[PDB]
Design a protein around this ligand. Structure first.
Ligand SMILES: Nc1ncnc2c1ncn2[C@@H]1O[C@H](COP(=O)(O)NP(=O)(O)OP(=O)(O)O)[C@@H](O)[C@H]1O
Ligand SMILES: Nc1ncnc2c1ncn2[C@@H]1O[C@H](COP(=O)(O)NP(=O)(O)OP(=O)(O)O)[C@@H](O)[C@H]1O
Ligand SMILES: [Mg+2]
Ligand SMILES: [Mg+2]
Lengths: 197, 304, 714
């Protein structure tokens, strides 16, 4: 009937990740309670949608995956990408070595006229960190599961070759996906053959 | 009719909206939960008869490490001889622990005790995450920021509610809640909010109170009676009318997204001397399907 | 027009006291003074002025009513000044002060006397005004009341040094006039042809009339104000916030004015108005009760028609006797508490079954909805604006220029009894009143058919033409400092307990409560504009005991400290208020701004509840702690030291914040090394290290660092 596949895994920070959001110069988005760095699910969803739109090219498949509010063709979002929270194993590893979860990066901007360097501070998530990511795929149609999952594989490949937040053309936000499990939590659909990345 | 306690522990922050995308409410009424349950039943192609005929549920109430919180009764409370501002404490009180519920009905809760109860709630932190929309940038435009008001619960806090019905209704609700863990409740479920895990069990601590008899009845859910019951159930009542609004979340209701008809329901905690049995009203305006608004009454009897 | 004569003779019964203080008894002097003016030579007025005491006092004249009203209201050094009302307020805990007013005015505690030359000047002014400007008539009593308010507010009502001279002449005269009107209505309802036998001939009849339930204490409260004003959307919400607040204020004033016009009473019976609340003193006649019932029904119907459940008005009245107003049996505060409890009971059961059934009887869905307040049951024009919403938008750009508010058959924003409020100047108000009768005009803070309302209308953007186009958004326009808006929510603590129990039982009376209420209302609705002078601040509301300000964040905190100092000066230390200050970006949701600042204020209202919350829940400080221990002790030295730095110390302050947030001893060593490498004053490094070492001083240090960082930013 209706099925939901749970894709849990880890996002490993290859290079310092800055997703904007006391007084800190360009702070990163954090969990309000634990004050831990997070990767908002909206960020991942938007980045994968943009990468898949670049790849395919809105297109119908993007509407099936990330949902559409267009008049007439109201499409439900098949992908629910939850916020990626700072991993507990990464938390223990960073508590060891006396390493902070976030680093401060200092950058210059050399003017094209006066050759004067304006400094700028940003905050990033340290390269050793990992985030527990959780995604739910809704099987609204059984015939498009393979197409949806190959589109997700293409988006994940593009994301692994892209950044996730901040200015990644200047060496920020590189990430890697490790898929711990892909198991059908709702319904009878067989997701054993399915794979991402 | 067997009462089942459903406890919901939330993984990600939740966006419970009142009127805006920036609103960060910590709870939802029985209307939102029942609409989510109906959507889940339609997704799983189950029958809607048990939900629409024999399920009585309460609002989503807070719970923390120490106690479960019930809505504050709208009872006439007496203060000290000259403590006029102390009444404001009872005005700011929203939830009372079950153990301290009866004491509140008997009038043995002072203003300082009410303030202690109000500050003793440890549900969580409400925040406002600022996001952006870069879709117009690719069309020679500008980014459009917006705000989502979320609420993150403390590690041992969450939202509980009580369900009443026969065995078949209870089991169907178990399947519906199991699917709702992964569907999510609230606002941006597809954008990383509302994910939770729920446990359904028996509630002796609540069966002690639900077996209590008294002279007054307290609403545990946002309810309203039909005209015939409203004729005689409104005498000596102390209630609070809430305007239930919103858009219809459905892919087949119409072409574009439209709002549903305005509804008005009594709040949780409203005290009546006559127990009225609500119903499931229709807030649909000539749509493809009938949009349901659950306003049945889950009652808690007490002595004033 | 015997009622009009009684009103004139009760508002001017003690007019001879000023002349007596200007060098027989004050009644003869008042009669002689009023006999100099032809319009005031009416028999009732003169009889009330010169016969209102037992020794001095047609068997049906209004002199008996004036005498008994003066006795009820009241309960010799001519130079004696006016003592501040807060001398006895909370005196059972904070002692009795000796603050007095000098001839807005602040009590200064110093020893002073009223010279007879000042009284001569007042007498000359009264003589000039009674001839050149004032006249008698049914519609001319409001101007007389406003003139009395403008002149006698700071003259003591009684100069006897045996008791406390808290009540001024204006308050005593207004209370006497209100009580006289109520007693006249009561006697007319009971068909009492003879007043001397009913009230005066034996003292037993006087005491028995003191036993009789003659008055009604009426409380009228609005519900839904916060959601109406602040739960709005759109980018133009900041340009309509003050308009919505002013609309609610004027609707409350129109409510009380219709209520008073129903009973043929003046505004002297309006004991208090403000903050969506109103206390009135009506007669206990059957006509009064039917009027109250009809008014409640019609206003409930109008509010359901126009706003449905968005706004509502609850009215609750309690019967009262003369000894209740005089606190002769210690049953004065019980009356007010019972009235408040009846009001809360009314607010509990708000609607009838028919009203709820019609609420749920909806035929068509919301379809289009307004940008602001997200309302859809009302018709929505183009640009997605509701009728009330676009009327409020039209009210602005007229509220910032014109100072007259006209309630007439034609206007912008609807008002009950099929009226409309618009904003015009003198010419517009004159035209509006001449085209159609039953048109009412209000003036804004104008010194003396116009009813003067005291409102806080201080807007900094309106002072400069270029910033007038962008009202509140111009406060984020700055050269240095973070472009943020500060929101200040202030609220007096335990005001209800101050009224009920703060005044000692020996001093509890209707005049004392009226004087205290008038002083608080004058402080909020008039003095806030004077206090906030020269600041980038807009007052959304100021009345009752609450206060809502939106401006530049630094200006907001500085003026919050100034307001705390001025409030301490005004209340003689007997009253304290708590505050919440939030700092938000421009384009931040205004509803979120209001809700979070209210959360901060409620955080400050805990325990001692004399605190200010700053930007979050972890910065709840005291007033002296924030002013001195945070700004005058930590922020100023660090700012002066870091101004010398080339980068202003932004990065070094960021490192200090990073080191301070953590709680490790090795990180204290890192902080010591950073302070050593700061290249600033060694005593300052020692002070900073000591402050970071001490708890409750590390929070202040962090707050000072963050304030300095915000000050030096872009
Ligand atoms: N014209 C106004 N504009 C803005 N704020 C106002 C205005 N008038 C009053 N206020 C403030 O707005 C609040 C009114 O909010 P509410 O309408 O909610 N009255 P509240 O006592 O808090 O609860 P109810 O028992 O009346 O339902 C007052 O308490 C003041 O804080
Ligand atoms: N000038 C005034 N005269 C008479 N009553 C007033 C005046 N200003 C405000 N009020 C009333 O004062 C009350 C203030 O109520 P609040 O809701 O502000 N609570 P309060 O008694 O001040 O103690 P706190 O919890 O704030 O520490 C309002 O409900 C109004 O009815
Ligand atoms: Mg107060
Ligand atoms: Mg207040």
């Amino acid at each position: 009937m209706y099925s939901k596949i749970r894709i849990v895994g880890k996002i490993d920070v290859l290079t310092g990740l800055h997703i904007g959001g006391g007084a800190i110069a360009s702070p990163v988005v954090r969990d309000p309670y634990s004050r831990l760095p997070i990767i908002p699910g909206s960020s991942i969803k938007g980045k994968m949608r943009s990468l898949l739109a670049k790849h395919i090219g809105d297109a119908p498949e993007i509407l099936r995956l990330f949902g559409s509010s267009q008049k007439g063709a109201i499409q439900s979002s098949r992908l629910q990408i939850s916020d990626a929270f700072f991993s507990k194993a990464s938390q223990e590893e960073f508590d060891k070595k006396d390493l902070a979860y976030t680093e401060t990066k200092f950058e210059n901007t050399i003017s094209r006229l006066t050759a004067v360097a304006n400094p700028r501070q940003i905050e990033r998530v340290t390269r050793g960190a990992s985030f527990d990511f959780h995604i739910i795929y809704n099987v609204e149609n059984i015939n498009e599961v393979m197409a949806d999952f190959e589109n997700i594989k293409t988006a994940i490949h593009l994301l692994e070759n892209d950044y996730l937040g901040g200015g990644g053309t200047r060496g920020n936000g590189r990430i890697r996906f490790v898929i711990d499990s892909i198991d059908t939590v709702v319904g009878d659909f067989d997701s054993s053959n399915l794979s991402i990345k | 009719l067997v009462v089942k306690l459903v406890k919901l522990t939330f993984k990600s922050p939740v966006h419970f909206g009142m009127k805006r995308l920036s609103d960060s409410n910590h709870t939802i009424a029985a209307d939102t939960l029942f609409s989510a349950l109906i959507i889940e039943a339609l997704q799983q192609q189950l029958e809607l008869s048990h939900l629409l005929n024999n399920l009585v549920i309460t609002d989503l109430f807070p719970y923390n490490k120490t106690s479960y919180f019930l809505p504050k009764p709208l009872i006439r409370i007496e203060g000290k001889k000259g403590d006029e501002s102390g009444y404001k404490a009872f005005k700011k009180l929203t939830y009372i622990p079950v153990e301290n519920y009866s004491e509140y009905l008997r009038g043995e809760i002072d203003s300082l005790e009410a303030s202690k109860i109000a500050e003793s709630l440890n549900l969580g932190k409400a925040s406002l995450s600022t996001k952006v929309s870069l879709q117009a940038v690719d069309h020679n435009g500008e980014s459009e920021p917006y705000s989502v008001g979320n609420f993150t619960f403390y590690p041992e806090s969450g939202l509980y509610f009580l369900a009443k019905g026969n065995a078949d209704t209870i089991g169907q609700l178990e399947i519906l809640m199991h699917a709702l863990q992964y569907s999510g409740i609230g606002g941006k479920r597809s954008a990383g909010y509302g994910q939770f895990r729920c446990t359904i069990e028996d509630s002796g601590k609540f069966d002690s109170l639900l077996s209590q008899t008294g002279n007054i009845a307290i609403l545990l859910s946002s309810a309203m009676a039909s005209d015939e019951e409203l004729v005689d159930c409104l005498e000596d009542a102390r209630y609070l009318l809430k305007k239930r609004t919103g858009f219809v979340q459905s892919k087949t209701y119409a072409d574009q997204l439209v709002k549903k008809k305005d509804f008005y329901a009594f709040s949780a905690g409203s005290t009546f001397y006559q127990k009225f049995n609500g119903k499931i009203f229709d807030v649909s305006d000539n749509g493809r399907h009938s949009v349901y608004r659950y306003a049945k009454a889950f009652w808690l009897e007490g002595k004033i | 027009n015997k009622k009009l004569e009684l009103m004139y003779g009760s508002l001017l019964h003690d007019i001879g006291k000023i002349v007596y203080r200007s060098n027989g008894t004050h009644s003869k002097i008042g009669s002689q003074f009023l006999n100099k003016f032809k319009p005031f030579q009416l028999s009732g007025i003169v009889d009330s002025v010169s016969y209102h005491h037992y020794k001095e006092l047609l068997d049906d004249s209004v002199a008996y009513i004036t005498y008994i009203a003066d006795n009820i209201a009241s309960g010799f050094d001519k130079r004696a000044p006016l003592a501040s009302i807060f001398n006895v307020v909370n005196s059972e805990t904070k002692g009795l002060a000796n603050y007095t007013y000098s001839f807005y005015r602040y009590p200064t505690d110093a020893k002073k006397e009223y010279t007879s030359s000042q009284y001569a000047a007042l007498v000359n002014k009264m003589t000039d005004d009674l001839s050149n400007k004032l006249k008698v008539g049914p519609d001319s009593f409001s101007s007389l009341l406003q003139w009395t308010e403008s002149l006698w507010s700071y003259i003591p009502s009684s100069t006897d040094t045996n008791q406390v001279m808290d009540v001024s002449l204006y308050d005593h005269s207004k209370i006497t006039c209100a009580i006289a009107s109520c007693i006249y209505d009561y006697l007319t309802e009971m068909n009492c042809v003879n007043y001397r036998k009913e009230l005066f001939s034996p003292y037993e009849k006087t005491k028995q009339f003191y036993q009789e339930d003659v008055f009604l204490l009426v409380s009228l409260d609005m519900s839904g104000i916060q959601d109406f004003i602040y739960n709005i959307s759109g980018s133009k919400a900041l340009k309509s916030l003050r308009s919505r607040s002013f609309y609610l204020e004027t609707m409350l004033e129109s409510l009380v004015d219709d209520l008073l016009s129903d009973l043929e009473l003046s505004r002297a019976n309006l004991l208090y108005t403000g903050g969506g609340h109103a206390y009135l003193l009506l007669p206990n006649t059957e006509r009064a009760r039917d009027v109250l019932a009809s008014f409640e029904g019609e206003m409930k119907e109008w509010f359901i028609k126009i706003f449905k459940t968005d706004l509502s008005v609850a009215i609750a009245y309690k019967a009262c006797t003369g000894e209740d107003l005089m606190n002769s049996n210690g049953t004065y505060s019980d009356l007010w508490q019972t009235v408040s409890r009846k009001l809360s009971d009314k607010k509990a059961h708000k609607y009838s079954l028919n009203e709820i059934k019609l609420f749920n009887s909806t035929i068509h869905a919301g379809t289009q909805e307004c940008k602001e307040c997200l309302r859809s049951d009302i018709d929505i024009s183009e640009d997605s604006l509701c009728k009330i919403c676009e009327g409020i938008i039209a009210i602005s750009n007229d509220l910032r220029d014109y100072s007259f508010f006209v309630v007439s058959p034609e206007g912008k924003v609807p008002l009950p009894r099929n009226r409309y409020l618009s904003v015009e100047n003198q010419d517009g108000a004159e035209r509006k009143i001449k085209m159609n009768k039953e048109t009412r005009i209000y003036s804004k803070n104008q010194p003396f058919l116009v009813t003067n309302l005291w409102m806080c209308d201080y807007d900094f953007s309106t002072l400069n033409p270029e910033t007038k186009k962008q009202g509140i958004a111009s406060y984020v326009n700055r050269e240095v400092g973070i472009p943020r808006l500060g929101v200040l929510r202030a609220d007096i603590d335990n005001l209800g307990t101050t009224f009920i129990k703060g005044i000692p039982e020996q001093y509890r009376s209707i005049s004392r409560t009226a004087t205290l209420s008038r002083q608080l209302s004058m402080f909020f609705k008039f003095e806030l504009s004077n206090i906030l002078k020269g600041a980038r601040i807009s007052v959304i509301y100021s009345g009752g005991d609450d206060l809502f300000l939106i401006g530049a964040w630094d200006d907001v905190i500085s003026k919050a400290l100034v307001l705390r100092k001025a409030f301490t000066r005004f209340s003689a230390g007997k009253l304290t208020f708590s505050a919440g200050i939030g700092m938000y970006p421009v384009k931040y949701p205004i509803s979120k701004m209001a809700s979070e600042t209210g959360v901060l204020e409620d955080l400050a209202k805990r325990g001692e509840k004399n605190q200010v919350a700053l930007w979050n829940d972890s910065k709840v400080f005291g007033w002296s702690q924030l002013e001195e221990q945070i700004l005058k002790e930590k922020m100023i030295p660090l700012q002066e030291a870091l101004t010398n730095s080339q980068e202003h110390g932004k990065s070094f302050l960021y490192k200090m914040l990073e080191l301070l947030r953590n709680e490790d001893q090795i990180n204290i060593a890192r902080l010591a090394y950073l302070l050593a490498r700061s290249s600033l004053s060694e005593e300052l490094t020692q002070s900073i290290f000591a402050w970071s070492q001490n708890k409750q001083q590390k929070v202040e240090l962090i707050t000072a660092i963050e304030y300095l960082v915000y000050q030096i930013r872009e």
